[PDB]
Amino acid sequence: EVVAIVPAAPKAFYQLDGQTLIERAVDGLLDSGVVDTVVVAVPADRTDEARQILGHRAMIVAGGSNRTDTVNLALTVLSGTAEPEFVLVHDAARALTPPALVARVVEALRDGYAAVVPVLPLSDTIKAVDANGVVLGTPERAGLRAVQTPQGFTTDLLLRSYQRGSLTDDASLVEHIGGQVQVVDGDPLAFKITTKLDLLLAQAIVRG
Amino acid sequence: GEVVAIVPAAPKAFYQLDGQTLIERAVDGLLDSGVVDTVVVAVPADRTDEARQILGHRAMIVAGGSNRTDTVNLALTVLSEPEFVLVHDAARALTPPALVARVVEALRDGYAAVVPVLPLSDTIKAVDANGVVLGTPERAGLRAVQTPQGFTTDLLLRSYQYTDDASLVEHIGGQVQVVDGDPLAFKITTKLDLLLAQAIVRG
Numbered sequence: 001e002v003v004a005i006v007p008a009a010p011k012a013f014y015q016l017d018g019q020t021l022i023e024r025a026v027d028g029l030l031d032s033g034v035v036d037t038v039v040v041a042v043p044a045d046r047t048d049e050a051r052q053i054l055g056h057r058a059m060i061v062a063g064g065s066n067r068t069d070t071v072n073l074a075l076t077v078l079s080g081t082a083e084p085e086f087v088l089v090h091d092a093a094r095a096l097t098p099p100a101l102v103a104r105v106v107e108a109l110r111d112g113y114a115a116v117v118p119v120l121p122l123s124d125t126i127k128a129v130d131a132n133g134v135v136l137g138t139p140e141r142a143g144l145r146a147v148q149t150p151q152g153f154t155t156d157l158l159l160r161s162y163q164r165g166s167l168t169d170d171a172s173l174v175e176h177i178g179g180q181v182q183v184v185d186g187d188p189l190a191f192k193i194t195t196k197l198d199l200l201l202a203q204a205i206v207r208g
Numbered sequence: 209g210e211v212v213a214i215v216p217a218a219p220k221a222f223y224q225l226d227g228q229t230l231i232e233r234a235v236d237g238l239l240d241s242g243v244v245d246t247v248v249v250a251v252p253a254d255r256t257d258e259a260r261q262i263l264g265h266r267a268m269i270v271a272g273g274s275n276r277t278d279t280v281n282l283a284l285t286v287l288s289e290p291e292f293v294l295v296h297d298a299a300r301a302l303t304p305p306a307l308v309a310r311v312v313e314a315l316r317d318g319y320a321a322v323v324p325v326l327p328l329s330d331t332i333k334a335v336d337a338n339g340v341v342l343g344t345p346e347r348a349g350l351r352a353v354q355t356p357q358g359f360t361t362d363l364l365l366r367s368y369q370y371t372d373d374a375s376l377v378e379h380i381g382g383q384v385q386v387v388d389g390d391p392l393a394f395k396i397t398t399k400l401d402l403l404l405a406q407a408i409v410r411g
Contacts, residue, residue: 119335123395124352125372129325135384138375146330169331172344183339188400192329197391204407
């Protein structure tokens with residue numbers, strides 16, 4: 001079984017052509033055809049708005065304060081008895097994420113990979129820079145990748161990952177507990193909608 | 209001390225973003241900054257004549273070369289007396305004039321090599337040849353570099369003794385300083401950029 005968690009962490013909840021971004025992300029998930037269930041994971045404060053809108057549709061769980069609290073809590077609920085085989089975690093602001101991408105992630109989990117991110121080559125030269133604005137070096141662009149969501153995991157791994165802490169990107173948790181994570185093509189359409197420019201692009205895209 | 213700008217473009221240059229080719233937009237942005245005195249556009253020899261018809265008094269045109277670095281030497285070679293040289297990517301047609309002023313300003317403040325740069329929307333990861341994540345260099349202050357990149361001519365010249373100019377300057381030992389870029393300065397490449405470009409240019 002496959003369950004996606006869309007954590008609410010305002011932005012995810014802003015409007016885009018008659019739908020909040022998080023509604024669209026959730027739909028992009030359901031329509032992938034490979035996702036059985038979406039939990040929306042929201043802090044207490046936003047449980048009313050989350051219910052009116054995403055009213056199942058999806059499971060709602062609420063809520064910690066941090067993003068990681070609400071993912072943790074959601075992890076707690078996906079539980080044991082009805083525990084799914086795989087769990088995706090998807091950024092609500094990646095509202096235009098293509099279903100194929102989604103399926104491409106699930107297919108890799110189905111193929112043994114316990115952890116999987118969608119990834120794109122970098123379009124700009126990348127430099128490492130210090131606090132005083134001085135270039136520290138220019139790492140090789142090949143070798144480096146930009147990563148998107150949804151990120152997919154065997155739920156056992158992601159549970160474990162999260163439990164470790166204390167002591168953003170979910171895969172970096174896995175990476176921290178020494179899990180190995182694998183890569184699949186992303187899609188520019190899956191950009192995080194963060195700015196007016198972002199929005200502008202999102203707008204132009206939906207009504208094309 | 210004069211400020212010159214080179215636009216190595218040797219088919220992005222001539223692509224017509226609703227009514228103006230990107231080369232003309234790139235050239236205007238450099239001009240509107242108010243601190244660029246000369247622009248040299250390098251294009252393939254086949255297109256040398258046509259690029260003149262487009263740009264007129266705005267840019268002296270020179271013929272290109274095989275790769276990029278190759279032409280830049282040539283473009284460079286032409287002049288043959290500026291103090292600062294900017295190199296700019298014509299694919300960044302919607303660069304704001306301010307960003308260029310910000311680059312020119314840093315040069316006048318002593319820094320011999322300046323580049324505009326931006327924080328990164330997505331998490332960057334290091335990935336090996338098999339698609340296995342090596343790690344997340346979140347602590348390295350990674351940055352997305354833009355153009356125009358600016359140098360003292362003297363420094364840019366020594367450097368020419370892979371499309372990122374500043375790399376050579378770091379390669380001869382020279383230190384490069386950063387200023388803030390601007391997302392408007394993005395590189396128009398993918399179909400999505402084209403759409404982004406349109407949305408903006410006609411907003």
